[PDB]
């Protein structure tokens, strides 16, 4: 039942600009689902049926490499 919502992607900082483009360019390949836009990214999340916890784990991961993991 929509383990992830669109507002989650929004608050994750995944909206336009350059920083959010880097955010998606990282997160996508960190999930092996390639690149997308916001809506396309959400639809890919839905179609591959990936779990919320692994999504958050990779989120924290890519923030750490952003912060110098």
């Amino acid at each position: 039942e929509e383990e992830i919502t669109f507002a989650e992607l929004i608050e994750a900082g995944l909206v336009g600009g350059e920083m959010a483009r880097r955010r998606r360019q990282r997160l996508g390949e960190e999930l092996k689902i390639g690149y997308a836009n916001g809506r396309q990214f959400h639809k890919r999340l839905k179609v591959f049926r990936i779990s919320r916890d692994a999504f958050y784990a990779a989120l924290a991961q890519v923030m750490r490499e952003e912060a110098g993991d």
């Binding site: 092996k32 689902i33 390639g34 396309q40 639809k43 890919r44 179609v47 591959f48």
Partner: protein, 275 residues
Amino acid sequence: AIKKYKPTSNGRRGMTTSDFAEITTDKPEKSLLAPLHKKGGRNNQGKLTVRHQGGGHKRQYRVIDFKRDKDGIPGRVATVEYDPNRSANIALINYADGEKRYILAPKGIQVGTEIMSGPEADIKVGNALPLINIPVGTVVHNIELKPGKGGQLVRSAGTSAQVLGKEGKYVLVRLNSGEVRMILSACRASIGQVGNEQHELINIGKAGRSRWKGIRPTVRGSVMNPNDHPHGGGEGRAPIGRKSPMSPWGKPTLGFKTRKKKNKSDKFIVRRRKN
């Protein structure tokens, strides 16, 4: 179904074969053939460049519509014939304006049904239409990559691919090998799964039966001279005397990926196949 021969001799000991339950006729349409001579794996220099090929029963090529562009015109299934070049079976269509064509016969269909091929045909086996007008979750076969070129993706007997969602000008599609890939939304596709799925269970039975499908014997590498293969020579039944098994042209042949690194299509492959 599958017919099993009774073991009257060592020849047919385990042999089995199909039964052609669906073939409705036995004479091809005359005005739809073309000459075709086998080539025995020899390029335009008369040199052998592909081993294990040659001989076999003479065939005659049927011409098949892979574009399926005639639209708005309701065709009609007439027969289901047997094609010695494909692996699947082909059907004959009678368009209501007097024209006859061959179609890869998907499973389920039988003589009498109707066909439409426009971007307005409804979701139904046999019909064809561009990918955009196709709802999500349906199975599909005979996919094409460049618009207006004709299908060249999943095509053999029993294969079937699936649609997975819409995008701007691309579509997410999972192929038969479990690979996922974006595809231009303007291409056409063919509903339903290719019939004749039992084709994978057939047991050949005896050497001659593969001989007369144009297949020649293959000599294992480990029994040649060292002059002819990186496996040659030895005590006499000696193991691989190298760090990895190698192709006859000196290249590793276990797990050594070969897809080109700088391919100009990787931007369309979202999930490489797994196994």
